[PDB]
Amino acid sequence: RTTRDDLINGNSASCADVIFIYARGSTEAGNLGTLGPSIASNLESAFGKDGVWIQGVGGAYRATLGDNALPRGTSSAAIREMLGLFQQANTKCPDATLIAGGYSQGAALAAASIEDLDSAIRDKIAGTVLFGYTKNLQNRGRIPNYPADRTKVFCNTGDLVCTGSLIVAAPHLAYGPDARGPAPEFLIEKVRAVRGS
Template structure:
């Protein structure tokens, strides 16, 4: 059964329905609706925390961490590790429909934030994460992480990943958790967006539990 889309998402569907977004070969083309609303986290500007999450939002989400998957995940991490132990830094990239499939500027910013976290907070344990187009940034930026950055990354968590099943360079498969909901056509390689692609807030607890299994305070 398909649930009705939120009003804001329906509007975005109408706005972007004519946009064709080419993924790098051999991937197909997508017409992709953005997420709804958003929030901003810039915790790297503050004091160092034991855990640092570098997070990239999905296409069309506002702020720098959006609202669909990120904030529920961060709340679950706070519950799992205790308030004050987790810093969240959103990736300030365009997240536009035109960049879906390849955003070199976004990739560079994400890699740069991993480097900043390592240099500013050498003892922090890093989680890289993203939703939809943001998950693509995790894949595409990983080859640019420094050796120190890769060593500091303890987990990667991906929601609605268009590159579902593709390895992340330099990160062990055992440290990667991908959430792809049944009926999410983005993960299946189809160009049809269903409500399943907006469901990943429901995976927040499981995502935090996975991270807790990879990090020791």
């Protein structure tokens, strides 16, 4: 279950109401890595398999560990890849509500992409979850240009990347419980807040 390309594969004539775009952590497998599958299963329970499209950021995003040290905490090629997926969602399914997330390098990628996005598309992302956010200190827990009420950051005590370092310590690898419960809970709540049900 570590690769999902529902947006790329999806039929434009039968668009899902909710599209989730997720970026994995460094060196992780597929395009969802270790946390994305848990979030996806719970979104599908809430909205149904036909109700939500799960899309990982693959393509040019190689999730190379060394790219954590670059200015935006990931590469320019990776940002272009995720921007392209938000633009594909907006073109293919203009009425869908979007939600996003990322872990570790993927959280820096999600923040850089949303910062650069056209505002009319950015404003369709009803909620974003970030785990082990490598730019947490530098950005003061926020995503630039995106509202605090639509953001949820999961940063464990002792996870040094949340406090301005790039050292990987054991708390960085402990976000499994959050991806199984509070992170899908937040995303579902933020989609229902604007779509009703």
